Design a protein around this motif. Structure first.
Motif, mmCIF file in Angstrom:
data_model
loop_
_atom_site.group_PDB
_atom_site.id
_atom_site.type_symbol
_atom_site.label_atom_id
_atom_site.label_comp_id
_atom_site.label_asym_id
_atom_site.label_seq_id
_atom_site.Cartn_x
_atom_site.Cartn_y
_atom_site.Cartn_z
ATOM 1 N N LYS A 70 0.743 -0.959 -0.004
ATOM 2 C CA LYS A 70 -0.006 -0.043 0.021
ATOM 3 C C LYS A 70 0.785 1.417 0.151
ATOM 4 O O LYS A 70 0.480 2.213 -0.739
ATOM 5 C CB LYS A 70 -0.786 -0.031 1.160
ATOM 6 C CG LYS A 70 -2.221 -1.052 1.208
ATOM 7 C CD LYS A 70 -2.891 -0.998 -0.165
ATOM 8 C CE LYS A 70 -3.430 0.258 -0.220
ATOM 9 N NZ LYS A 70 -4.388 0.690 0.934
ATOM 10 N N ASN A 71 1.937 1.457 0.822
ATOM 11 C CA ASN A 71 3.072 2.257 0.851
ATOM 12 C C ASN A 71 3.689 2.327 -0.371
ATOM 13 O O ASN A 71 3.870 3.526 -0.911
ATOM 14 C CB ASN A 71 3.898 2.182 2.089
ATOM 15 C CG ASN A 71 4.773 3.532 2.323
ATOM 16 O OD1 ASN A 71 4.472 4.582 2.065
ATOM 17 N ND2 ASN A 71 5.962 3.125 2.581
ATOM 18 N N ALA A 72 3.809 1.481 -0.921
ATOM 19 C CA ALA A 72 4.665 1.446 -2.468
ATOM 20 C C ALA A 72 3.691 2.010 -3.496
ATOM 21 O O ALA A 72 4.038 2.674 -4.134
ATOM 22 C CB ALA A 72 5.094 0.035 -2.549
ATOM 23 N N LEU A 73 2.474 1.621 -3.351
ATOM 24 C CA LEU A 73 1.385 1.945 -4.415
ATOM 25 C C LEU A 73 1.004 3.629 -4.158
ATOM 26 O O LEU A 73 0.874 4.222 -5.087
ATOM 27 C CB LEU A 73 -0.045 1.300 -4.333
ATOM 28 C CG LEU A 73 0.260 -0.390 -4.612
ATOM 29 C CD1 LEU A 73 -1.213 -0.823 -4.324
ATOM 30 C CD2 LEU A 73 0.445 -0.300 -6.131
ATOM 31 N N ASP A 74 1.029 3.985 -2.986
ATOM 32 C CA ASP A 74 0.653 5.235 -2.747
ATOM 33 C C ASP A 74 1.604 6.312 -3.426
ATOM 34 O O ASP A 74 1.412 7.422 -3.484
ATOM 35 C CB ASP A 74 0.535 5.266 -1.218
ATOM 36 C CG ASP A 74 -0.150 6.961 -0.751
ATOM 37 O OD1 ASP A 74 -1.325 7.015 -0.785
ATOM 38 O OD2 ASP A 74 0.753 7.837 -0.558
ATOM 39 N N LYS A 75 3.038 5.803 -3.305
ATOM 40 C CA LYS A 75 3.923 6.607 -4.038
ATOM 41 C C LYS A 75 3.647 6.985 -5.498
ATOM 42 O O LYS A 75 4.087 7.978 -5.842
ATOM 43 C CB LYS A 75 5.413 5.829 -3.963
ATOM 44 C CG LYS A 75 5.644 5.575 -2.367
ATOM 45 C CD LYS A 75 7.236 5.042 -2.264
ATOM 46 C CE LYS A 75 7.636 4.683 -0.888
ATOM 47 N NZ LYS A 75 6.638 4.000 -0.317
ATOM 48 N N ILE A 76 2.894 5.845 -5.867
ATOM 49 C CA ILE A 76 2.542 6.109 -7.324
ATOM 50 C C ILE A 76 1.350 6.836 -7.712
ATOM 51 O O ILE A 76 1.087 7.512 -8.683
ATOM 52 C CB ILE A 76 2.642 4.879 -8.132
ATOM 53 C CG1 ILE A 76 3.907 4.352 -8.552
ATOM 54 C CG2 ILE A 76 1.564 4.703 -9.466
ATOM 55 C CD1 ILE A 76 4.851 3.927 -7.561
ATOM 56 N N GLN A 77 0.242 6.619 -6.694
ATOM 57 C CA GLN A 77 -0.897 7.293 -6.805
ATOM 58 C C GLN A 77 -0.862 8.360 -5.912
ATOM 59 O O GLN A 77 -2.211 8.942 -5.707
ATOM 60 C CB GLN A 77 -2.049 6.236 -6.280
ATOM 61 C CG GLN A 77 -1.985 5.629 -5.056
ATOM 62 C CD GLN A 77 -3.002 4.549 -4.700
ATOM 63 O OE1 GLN A 77 -3.389 3.888 -5.458
ATOM 64 N NE2 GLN A 77 -3.282 4.544 -3.316
#
Length: 20
Positions: free
Chosen positions: A13-20
Motif C-alpha cells: 500500500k505504501n509502495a502503491l501510494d507513492k505512485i497514486q
C-alpha cells in the motif's frame, strides 16, 4: 499469531501510494 502478512500488504500500500 503474527499479523505480519497484513503489514506486508501495508508495504504494498505504501509502495502503491507513492505512485497514486
Amino acid at each position: 499469531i503474527i499479523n505480519v502478512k497484513t503489514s506486508l500488504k501495508t508495504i504494498i500500500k505504501n509502495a502503491l501510494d507513492k505512485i497514486q
